[PDB]
Design a protein around this ligand. Structure first.
Ligand SMILES: Nc1ncnc2c1ncn2[C@H]1C[C@H](O)[C@@H](COP(=O)(O)OP(=O)(O)OP(=O)(O)O)O1
Ligand SMILES: Nc1ncnc2c1ncn2[C@H]1C[C@H](O)[C@@H](COP(=O)(O)OP(=O)(O)OP(=O)(O)O)O1
Ligand SMILES: [Fe+2]
Ligand SMILES: [Fe+2]
Ligand SMILES: [Mg+2]
Ligand SMILES: [Mg+2]
Lengths: 563, 563
């Protein structure tokens, strides 16, 4: 935060909010200022025409050529070089949009390049007359690939985005059986288990999402079932990888192939080009405006009594407000040329190649890009109205969303905002007006989207069952977590929730304690002190002598830096 | 320029100049505003405590460990990984200072890591029972190293600094004979000749400076004389590498080892630590304030007549002004903690490891860091005063500089400002007051530092001879160029100027036409049109179908983007 690149970003942030204050209609800013809604990234958009997140079309760029910076890159002739260009792209893309960036199916996209490192090695055992032909190659290739993903793993943690930060990047895999594809998968997983750096700590990025599917990943007999096992190990030691149910995913998205989340959890919906092809990679999201659901209910109290009709009034009113807010920023996009971000619009990233002087707004119309109507705190809302209305209000929302899509041509969808930050702001702005409302603003924060309350006491299986239906309503983005104790040696139980989840819902992640004592090397849950974590079996307390990760909200982090 | 990262940098720039307007004493800003002096980087410093340029202590970082971003890196066990960490460091450092960044003697620093790629390969020909032991290794290692520097070459052109730009980076080599050291040298050189990207164009960065020295690089019998030959080829095809006379360099700097330039041409002077060791790597420069020499003379005209005494008055007056300006920004550095730029002050970069809460100002005191008093236009000055006073005014300047050093403890030195940009601004600000003064402001720009006028008509040998003495007066930074026609096949003549130069001066570069037609593949000087370059032997004119580089001022660039 005192670091230079950050100071600089901050400057551009202050200037941006200032310009926003002037571009955004007074009534929308007012609502944002007071917590009715929340216009995300007001420190980037609409001051400059940034977009949000995306699925980089890596196959397109690496396949054909592309210019990156000053280099007109050619197709990689080796695996290591591809995961380099990828780490470089990760950085450039992170610097031309204010949202997460995702490389979907690296196992399948990067496969060709393993097949080249192999070719190269076979032609080498054959040049130097080596005993084992097919055996040299295997080995060398297995290594080249581990190193290649160890490079990526590190480069994502050493390369900075223009705002002076590590790229928020997501890598997905799992639907590949070819030997090269399987090789990348174990490559990614072994590296993560290994840990980042000298002390093999749990990296916070890149996120790892593995698709699990019947006949590939989840049954004792399926081909990559061994991979599932390494995956369970990995997750029990570093949280990631999260898993996505290929079955429910396809069903919910409408795509014939599993849809990877752009960033944390923004899902695209199936879309086709002029020639009728389902396009996934290269597509993106235009932004997010989150609706403070609790605040709708609170604002519609008469005295200390909830008034149902008042709710129906403000709801419809705030629904329109949100549409006006989203449409505001989308319009700011008119006139903007491709000159604004070459790797996105001119070279491969967004899946097309626009001329410099082309408008960028057309590339997003008619459903290619998605737009987010975010919500939060279904729990506190229920408490305020007196009954679970979650499944249904979210549904009254898709209804509006559908009308919007039809009137504007933009593909709007229900997004369950991660709100690592918003969970506090809204509560705080609401507390400012309503004081400490029991069970609502009292705890200090709101529960994520449709998640069960933490303070509730259910069974992992019961929790996923209570949430699963939402994975089908809030299609724009969604995820479910369940808390388990150390599972390092109980992978069967861990695999039991994964299995149950992969059946009933879509995007799933299980977060359990992942700690490491540097002095004593204890992979056991440190016990919390009124002053941090303490090593049970070595008494270690100095924070610098340990790595303590916990996914308290959306990302992982050391909970000893917050209070 | 419409590109996002740049828009953002711009915002932070406007905010920074604004804050400077408030921090910098009115009289200094006034002088800057009017062209008497020129406070460089007012868009970074003093708004934030940035520093200028430096020699990264890569040996220190790679040797011991170091944290970069989130990764606690360990010593490279392979050559490719070292030139990766280097490309990553290049980026991080470029993002914590507003000046060039240099990696001195990559041949010697990176040597160990070639010796490891070799070890690894020998142990492999020995594991797979390969025919040629020492021969497999050689080959594999020779390749690993070419690839390693081809990665660096590219990564410097694809990685961005926080301001949305390719790092201004300099790589030096040449004083190494070990086989590994020689290997890096040819590695660097072959890659450059190869060209950047699909169309093998002349990269603009990283700059290449090779030290040439008797008994190593420049005589038919010396060991790396073959390298000199590849070097001459390289330079004739891509401008770089520039050369530095190890003999005169040591002499001028006082260092026992050739001193590499921080950035374009900022030379350090020999300095020692508490234990009496000459330290080079890790040292840096605090900044630059350039004095408009011509403007001193013009301002000291009485009517249309130059008045000598008036000159002596303003000169002494402006000399003090410059000192007050430099001291201004240096003071802004008091209080600043190491938390401001970890890779520089906490991890290896600046050669020491400060605690977070340590002040950074102490690290620069008592001569470790240099400070720049820049000057420009010795030619126009001569014309205004009526006689060459260059060698001597620069000398009256070192005198002041020496007093400053003694009063402040900071190591001030005469810097011959590159002024790729300033060469026009000063002239323009002066023209604003004196109209079009014959031979001075009339041409539109001022001649760099002590360089002979372009419009003059001398012999390469005569030009270097007229400049050489300045390489010994303006010790803070200096360089000489000479213009030659295509030399692609005349390396002996090219080597003749290099040889003559390496004898009489210090930092040398020869710029000749380096063009390439993409449609016809003609490495011949395109002939200039009132509308760009035209291919002689293929008539090609479309700019996109060619790469036309020319070092018109300090950097190389396509002269078809300016007018
Ligand atoms: N491509 C990379 N970019 C940045 N840091 C890297 C990269 N690859 C590895 N590192 C980090 C991790 C460790 O601190 C150290 C490892 O170097 P190195 O041992 O060469 O890696 P490696 O695992 O590919 O090789 P090996 O298996 O030979 O040890 O550098
Ligand atoms: N480390 C790197 N980072 C970014 N781009 C790179 C890197 N290495 C090479 N490139 C670019 C240059 C070309 O457009 C293309 C070359 O890929 P590749 O052919 O694998 O390089 P190479 O020269 O190391 O291998 P080879 O000798 O096998 O061709 O990618
Ligand atoms: Fe411990
Ligand atoms: Fe041509
Ligand atoms: Mg190649
Ligand atoms: Mg290693």
């Amino acid at each position: 935060s005192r670091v230079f690149p950050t100071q600089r970003d901050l400057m551009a942030g202050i200037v941006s909010k200032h310009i926003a204050k002037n571009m955004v209609p007074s009534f929308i800013m007012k609502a944002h200022e007071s917590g009715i809604i929340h216009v995300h990234d007001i420190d980037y958009s609409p001051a400059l025409p940034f977009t949000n997140c995306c699925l980089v079309d890596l196959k397109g760029m690496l396949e054909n050529g592309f210019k990156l910076g000053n280099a007109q890159i050619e197709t990689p002739k080796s695996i290591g070089v591809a995961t380099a260009i990828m780490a470089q792209i990760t950085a450039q893309v992170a610097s031309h949009q204010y949202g997460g960036t995702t490389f979907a199916n690296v196992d399948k996209v990067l496969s060709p390049y393993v097949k080249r490192t192999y070719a190269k090695h076979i032609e080498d055992a054959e040049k130097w007359q080596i005993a084992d032909a097919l055996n040299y190659a295997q080995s060398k290739t297995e290594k080249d690939v581990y190193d290649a993903f160890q490079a990526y793993e590190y480069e994502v943690n050493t390369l900075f985005s223009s705002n002076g930060q590590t790229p928020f990047v997501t890598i997905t895999f799992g639907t590949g059986t070819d030997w090269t594809e399987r090789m990348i998968q174990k490559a990614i997983l072994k590296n993560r288990i290994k840990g980042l750096g000298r002390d093999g700590i749990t990296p916070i990025f890149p996120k790892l999402v593995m698709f699990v599917e019947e006949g590939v990943n989840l049954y004792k007999d399926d081909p990559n079932y061994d991979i599932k096992q390494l995956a369970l190990e990995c997750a029990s030691k570093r949280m990631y990888p999260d898993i996505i149910s290929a079955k429910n995913n396809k069903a919910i998205t409408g795509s014939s192939v599993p849809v990877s989340p752009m960033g944390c959890r923004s899902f695209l919906s199936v879309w086709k080009d002029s020639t009728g092809n389902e396009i996934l990679d290269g597509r993106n999201n235009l932004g997010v405006v989150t609706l403070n659901l609790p605040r709708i209910a609170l604002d519609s109290y008469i005295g200390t009594q909830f008034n149902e009709q008042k709710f129906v009034e403000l709801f419809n009113e705030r629904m329109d407000l949100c549409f006006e807010a989203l449409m505001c920023r989308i319009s700011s996009l008119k006139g903007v040329k491709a000159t604004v971000a070459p790797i996105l619009y001119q070279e491969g990233a967004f899946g097309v190649r626009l001329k410099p002087d082309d408008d960028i707004i057309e590339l997003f119309k008619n459903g290619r890009s998605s737009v987010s109507l975010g919500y939060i705190g279904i729990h506190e809302l229920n408490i305020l109205v007196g009954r679970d209305i979650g499944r249904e209000i979210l549904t009254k929302m898709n209804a509006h969303l559908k009308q919007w899509t039809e009137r504007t041509g933009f593909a709007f969808s229900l997004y369950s905002t991660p709100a690592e930050n918003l969970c506090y702001r809204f509560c705080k702005l609401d507390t400012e007006k309503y004081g400490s409302v029991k069970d609502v603003t009292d705890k200090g924060w709101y529960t994520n989207s449709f998640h069960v309350s933490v303070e509730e006491n259910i069974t992992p299986f019961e929790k996923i069952s209570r949430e699963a239906p939402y994975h089908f309503i809030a299609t724009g983005g969604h995820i479910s977590y369940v808390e388990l104790p150390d599972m390092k040696n109980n992978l069967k139980g861990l695999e039991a929730v994964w299995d149950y989840a992969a059946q009933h819902l879509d995007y799933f992640g299980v977060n359990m304690p992942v700690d490491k004592c540097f002095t004593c090397g204890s992979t056991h849950e440190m016990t919390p002190t009124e002053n941090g974590f303490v090593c049970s079996i070595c008494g270690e307390t100095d924070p610098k002598k340990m790595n303590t990760i916990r996914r308290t909200c959306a990302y992982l982090g050391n909970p000893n830096e917050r209070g």
